[PDB]
Design a protein around this ligand. Structure first.
Ligand SMILES: Nc1ncnc2c1ncn2[C@@H]1O[C@H](COP(=O)(O)OP(=O)(O)O)[C@@H](O)[C@H]1O
Ligand SMILES: Nc1ncnc2c1ncn2[C@@H]1O[C@H](COP(=O)(O)OP(=O)(O)O)[C@@H](O)[C@H]1O
Ligand SMILES: Nc1ncnc2c1ncn2[C@@H]1O[C@H](COP(=O)(O)OP(=O)(O)O)[C@@H](O)[C@H]1O
Lengths: 370, 59, 370, 370
């Protein structure tokens, strides 16, 4: 029997069947509730909308993400999202399918305990399993060695692997991702006059970010160039007409990944935490880590991010190593692709957590063994 | 308004005070009984050491 | 030579000389133009009236504020208001006094650039400077640490400051203030029969708001009390006779500050945005922020706003912190008082933007360095 | 003339006068610099704060230790810390006092060369001397024979001494100490939900470590006991409220000293390196070494560390020897106490490195004779 792969993420649910090339259902991980009165008697108003139905009706709803920084902070909303994913998007019965969920590294244990308890009780999956996103990304990249930099909507983390062995003491987790860049852009757009305060307006700004922002190779002279001429200015049209034009914001928004002090954080840029995670590894494997930086996730999709990353790491590493940033063109779904590959392996069918093991050991089995 | 506010708040303060006091005296009982227990363990250890050195001289 | 302090605000100009205890001129920031015909030949009708001269000829004029939400949206009217402020209220020559202007945080750059250009070109000030209203409010409160909540006529904002260091990533700006409460009161008074639609009637309703409205410590049982008895009803006499009596509107008008959903806004109340701004600061300074909530501006002058604010923040914060709301009895002029203190400091006389620096750098001098 | 003792260490400066019973000044060896903006004109902004002044303002500063693993890696910051120690804490003139610095064994020569050059040039001390921490700890213990395990903030080392003769081939130096335990605890607390990433939060976690952590006599059954009941859970209150409760982390943190694989190190626990350093000594002195294990430094202050140490070494050594772990109650200042004793000896006054010897021989005089 086929299995389900349900990479959750903090901004997008990507589900599908183990053995496909791409996720079958990709929709926002969002729950909307009506905000206004409701006067038309007989309209049949729902209590809440999920997925991308809540996205087209977003004008009258208040949107909430049930996952903040990789952690599930609203379990009823997460249950709604899973119910939707199973019954309306994939149109299956969860009782007939093992499910491979995914989770960021180095986040609380109650998260996985609640995941597995929810699955086994309110969905009656025959078996399940909770992988780590970076490992699956490496599976999808077709490698067994490399330091993968995953950057989605909630959390950015490095995991260095060698020959299929993880270095759990060198795993570095950072908490600025797509959503903090969206908020920084919402804050930077006000200095031109545009004011986005609603959650629907946050979605609008997210789309502006996904369409017009890029990473400058050299930040300072890019700033000076944008100051001198006006060739960097593009235009965007809100969904009511009323075009807006942005200039240096285009590269000031994603630059925060390399100077997290823009949003008042004390951490270092992603280049520097990658270098530190490498320099925390055994001196023999780091020459092979330098040449297998695997970029993953949506927040790594800016134009020019691989070149800036390579420039920075080359400036940090010794002048003899060969820095290679590996950025596939489909790197936004690498975690799901690797998850499907993993759940399709024959030697994996003993790694599931069967219903009987859960019935014997309680929800605590998820990390105690698997 | 502020008077009844502070009054209910600080009556609850006296509530948690009674609770923390109960826990205080219970911890005092615990402390005294634990002193007695480690004293019994002290006589245990003194006796067993006397036995050990005596019987080891014998050995 | 003495300097001028010209806290503009969106509802009231407060000007004066640096070094005084209180502003010398306080008048409405408003420009009126006649609507009707004009029949008496030789009456000498002016083209437009500004300040409180437009407030006495209110009945025949149409009033317009050149500042909407902290942003100057009519630069000719703002030029008129500044010309009035200098030549008729203060009765000075702007060519002989540096000028300290004030502005809310997180508003467009063109606002400051135009302020600077106007001052230097069409008033020939020797120097100028544009402070932030919250910093000056803290100066006037006599402390170097605290989260100040400023709420004037157009905009409400929090600025957390510690030991003289601002936390610009935790500044939160909200766009409901005195004027939105005035409009909500104009709309809520129609359910008793009173209909104010004119701009003059908007001024009347503003006076009603300043004289009869208060914040209820507990909104629900206050509502039930007003429903039960009639001990909350007061009476007001319009300027033609015609007494009006209002009941629960008295506290339903300023309640919007704590439930901005009454006017269809999605934001959170001022208590909740204050708490969020605090919880966005470093864990070591927020205990000292919890005990220095400084209130400022006119919209913080309702009877019982400090008590409700303290109750709400106490309910939100941990049960060990000491929440102290600092509400001086003169907090309506805190920004001006702090501005005079600042402009009087000896160590400040190098922070001015001299005319020569402007002539070198252009209007962009203002935010680029000062 | 009296002399100064300046046990530097990598986490705490302990200074005083030769002849006292305890260090006169004990403050963190840390230098903080402001990261945020600074708005209040005239607040008197300092460029950098040192010592425990940087500890109270740590909410707005970024803290840095100029000593990483016993090695001084920032000589400007170290010069700042020494200047502070002499002028603000001890309030003396370094030109009138010989200074006894201290260093860990088996660290680069340039460290001592730069120490003595700094002293003689930018402080003009009349003479100086650089001792070894373990020897001074043995002085303070009142012995001439024993293997001393010193464990501070940066480095752990054993030095076996017999009749006042060191065995330099049996000195073993290990590079996990208090700071690596603090980092491991910061990483282990994330699996309960608490997230400390800032340097100030690292100080908070250090205090949690110093208040709630202990060494379990038997790690496995202690683990099972913590899993069974909940009697091991204590609670800590962060400096903003927000009570946190930790369970088996209390003893999982210092257990790393006995299983350095927890932080991904390959070495052996402190018990095993102690036993190895003993078994590297001549077969005649090791019976007297077995009974004079002298613990020293702050990291040896956990409750129950002496008993675990004795249990482990007893299990390793032959079943006839008498293992005695000597752990004084003031063992956190043994190095300074012994240094004061040493600098007070009359026969020591010929071992100083006079200014003239340095002027003749260059900085290389320090290790070349003394
Ligand atoms: N083309 C793009 N350019 C820049 N950023 C993007 C792009 N596409 C998506 N993003 C960012 O990626 C985030 C979603 O990425 P994703 O990997 O799906 O997150 P998650 O793994 O948490 O579901 C969004 O917040 C968005 O800001
Ligand atoms: N005593 C009062 N009670 C309630 N509201 C007041 C009072 N005085 C002034 N206001 C409100 O304050 C606003 C003006 O405040 P002010 O601080 O001058 O704003 P600004 O600084 O933007 O000019 C007016 O809109 C008015 O509604
Ligand atoms: N009571 C305690 N319990 C556990 N650890 C402690 C205690 N006191 C100090 N420490 C640890 O000891 C370190 C400081 O010890 P110290 O001997 O001063 O080091 P150094 O000699 O390098 O300055 C700190 O990192 C702290 O984690």
């Amino acid at each position: 029997t086929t299995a389900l792969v349900c990479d959750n993420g903090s901004g997008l649910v990507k589900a599908g069947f183990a053995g496909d090339d791409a996720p079958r259902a990709v929709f926002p991980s969002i729950v909307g509730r009506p905000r206004h009165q409701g006067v038309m008697v007989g309209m049949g108003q729902k209590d809440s909308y999920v997925g991308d139905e809540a996205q087209s009706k977003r004008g009258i709803l208040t949107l909430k993400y049930p996952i903040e920084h990789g952690i599930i902070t609203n379990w009823d909303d997460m249950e709604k999202i899973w119910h939707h994913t199973f019954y309306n998007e994939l149109r299956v019965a969860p009782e007939e399918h093992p499910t491979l969920l995914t989770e960021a590294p180095l986040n609380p244990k109650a998260n996985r305990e609640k995941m597995t308890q929810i699955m086994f009780e309110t969905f009656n999956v025959p078996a399940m399993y909770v992988a780590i996103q970076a490992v699956l990304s490496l599976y999808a990249s077709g490698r067994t060695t490399g330091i993968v930099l995953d950057s989605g909507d909630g959390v950015t983390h490095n995991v260095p692997i060698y020959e299929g062995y993880a270095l759990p003491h060198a795993i570095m987790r950072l908490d600025l991702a797509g959503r903090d860049l969206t908020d920084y852009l919402m804050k930077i757009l006000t200095e031109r006059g545009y004011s986005f305060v609603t959650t629907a307006e946050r979605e609008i700004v997210r789309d502006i970010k996904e369409k017009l922002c890029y990473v400058a190779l050299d930040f300072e002279n890019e700033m000076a160039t944008a100051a001198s001429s006006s060739s960097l200015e593009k235009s965007y049209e809100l969904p009511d007409g009323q075009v807006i034009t942005i200039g240096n914001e285009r590269f000031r928004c994603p630059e925060t990944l390399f100077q997290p002090s823009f949003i008042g954080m004390e951490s270092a840029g992603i280049h520097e935490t990658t270098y530190n995670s490498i320099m925390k590894c055994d001196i023999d494997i780091r020459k092979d880590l330098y040449a297998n930086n695997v970029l993953s996730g949506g927040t790594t999709m800016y134009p020019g991010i691989a070149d800036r990353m390579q420039k920075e790491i080359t400036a940090l590493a010794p002048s003899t190593m060969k820095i290679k940033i590996i950025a596939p063109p489909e790197r936004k779904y690498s975690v799901w692709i690797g998850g499907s590959i993993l759940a399709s392996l024959s030697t994996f069918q003993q790694m599931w957590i069967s219903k009987q093991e859960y019935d014997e050991a309680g929800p605590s089995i998820v990390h105690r063994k698997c | 308004h502020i008077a009844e506010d502070a009054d209910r708040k600080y009556e609850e303060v006296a509530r948690k005070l009674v609770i923390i006091e109960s826990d205080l005296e219970r911890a005092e009982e615990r402390a005294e009984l634990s002193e007695g227990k480690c004293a019994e363990l002290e006589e245990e250890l003194k006796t067993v050491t006397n036995n050990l050195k005596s019987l080891e001289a014998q050995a």
